[PDB]
Structure formats: structure tokens, C-alpha cells
Design a protein around this ligand. Structure first.
Ligand SMILES: COc1cccc(Cl)c1NC(=O)N1CCC[C@H](C(N)=O)C1
Ligand SMILES: [Zn+2]
Length: 139
């Protein structure tokens, strides 16, 4: 679980969005596993606007932060789950790191701010849904 809070927006994994997120929907993209909803209170986070390929992510299944080197946002095949049929997920970045299904939502940050959130994983891999291209989050 986990979310980014920036301005009057809450960014979450689309497969974990609540009834309240859908009732306050701003934008969603199943192919990116992202959903953004509106909030009344001002958020706490800053979004990176960069091309960093190193950062630190929060891993809830270890209660620990880990450093990672991650690939540029790309179209990656993701196996069928209870949430989605087998498909290509876009704007996804892969890294070597520990992750478990309940780790989705953990924030990946670089020196410039929030880069994205955990969205996929398996066998010593972790995938992050990028948010750096969503320029409208800052306005
Ligand atoms: C952090 O996720 C994992 C880590 C280790 C093992 C596994 Cl099987 C996962 N589960 C996943 O990758 N997904 C299940 C939930 C939805 C995901 C998606 N974006 O399509 C895919
Ligand atoms: Zn950066």
C-alpha cells in the first residue's frame, strides 16, 4: 500500500484504488496501473522532473529503504494477476531489488523528489510506475 500526495492530488496504484478514489477521479490509466484522485487538503510530496536512473525505494515487506539502479520508462510484459489480464504495462521501470505483492505503493525517490511507485515485481526484481511525465500534478 502507499500513495503520493502532491497539491490537491493523491496518486495510487490503480489496482489498489478505493471507492473514495473512484468517486473523486481525476485520471486513470490501466496500461500504467495509475489512478489520481482529488483531495481537500494540500499534499506533503514534491515530484522529480529529471532523467535519474538511481534512487531509493521503500520496501514495506522489509520495513526498509533500498538503493536501486532502474531502467528508463518502457513497455514491459506483465503476467496475468487477479487484477489484470496478461498485457504490456507502459511507463514501467525495472530494477534488481526485493519486492512482494503488498509492496505496491512504496515510493521511489531520487535527489530531485518523487520518481514513482512500486507497481510490479518478482524473483529479485521490482518495477516502478513512473510519474515524472505527469507535469499537471504540479498545477
Ligand atoms: C510488487 O508486485 C509483486 C512482487 C512480487 C511478486 C509479484 Cl507476483 C508481484 N505482483 C505483481 O507484480 N502484480 C500483481 C499486482 C498488479 C501488478 C501489475 N501492475 O499488473 C502485477
Ligand atoms: Zn532525479
Amino acid at each position: 500500500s502507499g500513495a503520493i500526495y502532491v497539491g490537491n492530488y493523491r496518486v495510487v496504484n490503480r489496482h489498489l484504488a478505493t471507492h473514495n478514489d473512484w468517486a473523486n477521479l481525476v485520471w486513470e490509466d490501466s496500461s500504467r496501473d495509475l489512478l489520481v484522485s482529488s483531495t481537500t487538503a494540500q499534499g506533503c510530496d514534491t515530484i522529480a522532473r529529471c532523467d535519474c536512473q538511481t534512487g531509493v525505494y521503500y520496501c514495506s515487506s522489509r520495513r526498509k529503504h533500498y538503493p536501486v539502479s532502474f531502467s528508463k520508462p518502457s513497455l514491459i510484459f506483465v503476467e496475468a494477476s487477479e487484477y489484470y489480464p496478461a498485457r504490456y504495462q507502459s511507463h514501467l521501470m525495472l530494477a534488481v531489488g526485493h519486492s512482494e505483492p503488498g509492496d505496491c505503493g512504496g515510493i521511489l525517490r531520487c535527489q530531485h523528489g518523487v520518481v514513482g511507485i512500486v507497481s510490479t515485481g518478482g524473483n529479485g526484481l521490482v518495477g516502478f510506475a513512473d510519474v515524472r511525465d505527469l507535469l499537471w500534478l504540479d498545477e
